[PDB]
Amino acid sequence: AEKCSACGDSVYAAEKVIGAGKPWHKNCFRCAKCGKSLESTTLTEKEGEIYCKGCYAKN
Numbered sequence: 001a002e003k004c005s006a007c008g009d010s011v012y013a014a015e016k017v018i019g020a021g022k023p024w025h026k027n028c029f030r031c032a033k034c035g036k037s038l039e040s041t042t043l044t045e046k047e048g049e050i051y052c053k054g055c056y057a058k059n
């Protein structure tokens with residue numbers, strides 16, 4: 001449950017940002033549209049990867 005599928009390492013508890021279930025490290029949170037740093041309020045994440053909210057702001 002508590003695992004970052006990006007680096008393959010497991011997550012801590014009070015660090016990793018959760019994208020509704022699927023937990024990823026703060027550093028491992030990289031967009032799938034543009035591919036930059038991301039750590040939002042709402043945060044965008046689809047069932048096709050994890051994105052930056054900035055991508056949808058532009059789009």
Ligand SMILES: [Zn+2]
Binds near residue numbers: 005006007025028
């Ligand atoms: Zn990670």
Ligand SMILES: [Zn+2]
Binds near residue numbers: 036052053054
């Ligand atoms: Zn992006």
